[PDB]
Every structure is written in structure tokens, then in C-alpha cells.
């Protein structure tokens, strides 16, 4: 939730706007990309328990894979707060570290 | 709602199962703390970074593959958990736990 927090936390410009757009749809195909292997590895869990509920080489294979993907996840979600970062003016990006600092600081706790 | 409490709310246990089941569910309440502290000293280590040097620095990236770890650690530790529960059911009341948790599983393949 840290994208959630940092999503129109600061002001926008017109040409900063257009620009954080068309990053959020990158981003947008990334998370969504990961979210499809989260889903695949779920089912396949399903699948897997409703067989045999114990912990099978589809169960451990399965579970990588939930794991791989539940950790993309939390690098995307900050490479997008840089990438993000990088698509404002050279004067308006302290604004969004400073809320960006404090989100983790919030976080760290 | 998560899996964990999915589960711990949907299907109840017994007076026997409750008290079963207390040191295994104090076991891993406590594994989740220790999985949340590294989280926390994770965003710290970010929070820090960034403050020195608002860019993706050795320690930006060290501090992310921590987080990487940690979110993937609770994954595991809480499949572990269900199964470790599952153990300490009566045999009739598993179907029921495990209907709750294909179900909240199928979930999140849609
Ligand atoms: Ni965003
Ligand atoms: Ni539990």
C-alpha cells in the first residue's frame, strides 16, 4: 500500500501528470503480469489440497512460486515509486521524497 | 480478510481442538513477529537510504531484496501453519477446514 499512499500525495503539473500516466500503465502491465502467476499458483494449490492436503512436490512447487511472486510484487511497487519519481521536475522531487520517507518511517513501524 | 483469518474465523473448533491447538498457533503467531521485524527494519534501512541519497544505492537495493524475502518468508510459514492445524483435527471436523481453505484458496486464483 505504499503505491496506494504515495498515488496523488504530491502536486502534479500538467506535463508531469501526462508523463506519471503513462508510467502507471507500464507499471499497471507488470503488476498485473505477476498477478496472473500469483492466481496460476493459487489454483494449482487448490488443486493440490483437494488431491492430497499434505505438503506434496505440487504443493512445494506451487508455493515457490507464490513466493516468487509475492516478492515481485513488493520490488515493483518500488521501482514504480522511483520510476515515478524520475518523471517529476527537478524541484518538485524532494516534495515527494519527503512523503516517501515518511511512508517507510510509518512502515518501519 | 486473510487466509489465516479465513480460516480462523470459518471453521471453529472444539473446547479439546482449542486447547490443542494453543501452543502451535502460539508458535507460529510468534514466527509471523519475527517475519513483520525484518519487514520494519527493511523499510527503516529504505527510509534511511533515501534520505542520504534519494536513488537506488547498494543499500536501496539490499534493503528491497530483504522485503523480497520477508514477504515470500510469510507465504511459506503461513501454508506450514495450515497444515500444522490441520494435524491437530479431529478427522471428521477436516473436511470442513479443508472446504474453507480450497474455497478462500480458489479465491485468489480468480
Ligand atoms: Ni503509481
Ligand atoms: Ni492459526
Do not use: C, M
Not at 2 to 18: C, F, K, M, Q, S
Not at 81 to 91: I, N, S, Y
Amino acid at each position: 500500500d505504499l503505491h496506494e499512499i504515495l498515488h496523488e500525495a504530491v502536486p502534479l503539473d500538467a506535463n508531469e501528470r501526462e508523463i506519471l500516466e503513462l508510467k502507471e500503465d507500464a507499471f499497471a502491465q507488470r503488476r498485473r503480469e505477476i498477478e496472473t502467476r500469483l492466481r496460476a499458483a493459487n489454483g494449482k494449490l487448490a488443486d493440490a489440497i483437494a488431491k492430497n492436503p499434505a505438503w506434496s512436490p505440487e504443493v512445494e512447487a506451487a508455493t515457490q512460486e507464490v513466493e516468487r511472486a509475492a516478492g515481485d510484487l513488493q520490488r515493483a511497487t518500488l521501482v514504480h515509486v522511483f520510476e515515478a519519481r524520475a518523471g517529476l521536475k527537478p524541484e518538485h522531487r524532494p516534495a515527494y521524497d519527503r512523503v516517501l520517507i515518511d511512508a517507510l518511517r510509518r512502515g518501519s513501524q
